[PDB]
Write a protein that binds this ligand. Sequence first.
Ligand code: NAP
Ligand code: RJY
Ligand code: CO
Length: 159
Amino acid sequence: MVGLIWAQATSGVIGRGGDIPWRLPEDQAHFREITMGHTIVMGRRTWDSLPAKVRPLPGRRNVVLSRQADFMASGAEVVGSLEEALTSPETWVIGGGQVYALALPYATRCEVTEVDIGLPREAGDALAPVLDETWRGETGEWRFSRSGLRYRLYSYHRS
Ligand SMILES: NC(=O)c1ccc[n+]([C@@H]2O[C@H](COP(=O)([O-])OP(=O)(O)OC[C@H]3O[C@@H](n4cnc5c(N)ncnc54)[C@H](OP(=O)(O)O)[C@@H]3O)[C@@H](O)[C@H]2O)c1
Ligand SMILES: CCOC(=O)c1csc(C)n1
Ligand SMILES: [Co+2]
């Protein structure tokens, strides 16, 4: 099973300037619950976005995708191809925009947090991948984050 997990603004923006223009503690908790114990695969830019004190994310096989053959990610595996990373029973692709697009053909689950923030797309933004007709969606109720933004969870599945 390869799953994708991300939070997006209602516009589809997931990243800006190399980071994220929001932070919902509830979404962090959900992210931790879904990924804990499993493989997590991220692009090198997303690895760079993690503070050194926090990586590798604990209790998970951290894998970083890079074209640089000698890129060092202390506490992670660095691979040059996404296929190399898909050997565990449950693999979560945790971003960013480029790696979501690369991983979508392998994916059968998308855990999507929609953040009710009015954030028009801009050049350079990282975006959520486009889900075509093969994906079946299940929608959660709107919730209030203690950060003051509403959010809801979508669970997309396909065979
Ligand atoms: N849920 C969220 O909202 C969420 C979650 C994660 C990240 N983000 C955001 O997403 C943004 C980063 O996304 P990104 O799209 O800019 O970068 P990315 O997908 O995080 O990583 C891109 C890098 O991955 C490597 N890569 C990409 N395609 C490759 C390929 N075909 N073969 C080998 N290596 C490849 C390259 O590394 P080298 O340059 O080392 O070759 C490339 O520079 C940040 O803003 C981050 O905060 C958001
Ligand atoms: C944003 C939802 O969950 C997170 O806190 C998180 C950990 S690592 C990463 C790229 N995002
Ligand atoms: Co699990």
